[PDB]
């Protein structure tokens, strides 16, 4: 079955997530208020939401067993490229197929297609994002699998700019093996049917959502009036060629 190390890893990731993802979304009040007039009217709010989310993803990443053994540069490299992917991933917890939106406890903090479209990004990205959310949602992942996937997403040895790939790759495998064994021993069929394969497919989807996001961020942030509505962390992480 499972293992001491594996169950240990799971317990840690679950707690790490519970400490970096607030189901009350109480912090959203601190963000620049959302405006629904792209008019970019939603950019100041989502920019802060995203920046905040980057800070929480880092908080989570630091607690991933083995992530501490990577060199600062490797850590930066991994978080730099995975951030947006993990944010889309953790967002599935607030997404609902009822109205196809992210319900973050409140109406103002309820975001639908036209809300997230008012921030400089087109349907070239939003269309696939929602599809992703629905497909992911349809997997009904246990919270154990959800956190292991975010963790596996973060420590991917093929990230551009990686140094000690062997180590990054080594740390991931341990998470992957923990995931595959968890599914086999804790996820009952039919739900478990090719669950691993489907979860890894979502990782490929995220790479794709990432690339499209990068292309629409460049275009967006290449315009001063737009890049000045962002936050310093966002500029640092998402690159700053303004």
């Amino acid at each position: 079955k499972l293992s001491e190390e594996q169950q240990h890893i799971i317990a840690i990731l679950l707690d790490a997530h519970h400490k970096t993802y607030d189901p009350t979304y109480a912090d959203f009040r601190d963000f620049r208020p959302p405006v629904r007039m792209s008019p970019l009217s939603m950019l100041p709010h989502l920019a802060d939401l995203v920046s905040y989310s980057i800070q929480k993803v880092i908080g989570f990443a630091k607690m991933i067993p083995g992530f501490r053994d990577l060199t600062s540069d490797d850590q930066i490299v991994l978080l730099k490229s995975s951030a947006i992917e993990v944010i889309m991933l953790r967002s599935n917890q607030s997404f609902t197929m009822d109205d196809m939106s992210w319900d973050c406890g409140s109406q103002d903090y309820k975001y639908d297609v036209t809300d997230v479209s008012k921030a400089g990004h087109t349907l070239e990205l939003i269309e696939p994002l929602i599809k992703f959310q629905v497909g992911l949602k349809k997997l009904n992942l246990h919270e154990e699998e959800h956190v292991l996937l975010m963790a596996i997403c973060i420590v991917s040895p093929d990230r551009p700019g990686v140094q000690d790939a062997k180590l990054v790759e080594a740390i991931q495998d341990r998470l992957s093996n923990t995931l595959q064994t968890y599914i086999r021993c804790r996820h009952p069929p039919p739900g478990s049917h090719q669950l691993y394969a489907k979860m890894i497919q979502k990782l490929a989807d995220l790479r794709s959502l990432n690339e499209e996001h990068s292309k629409q961020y460049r275009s967006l942030s290449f315009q001063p009036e737009n890049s000045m509505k962002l936050t310093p962390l966002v500029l640092e992480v998402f690159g700053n060629e303004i």
Partner: peptide, 11 residues
């Protein structure tokens, strides 16, 4: 590679 804030949040 020039990421003080990321660096600061990471350590």
């Amino acid at each position: 590679k020039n990421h003080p804030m990321l660096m600061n949040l990471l350590k």
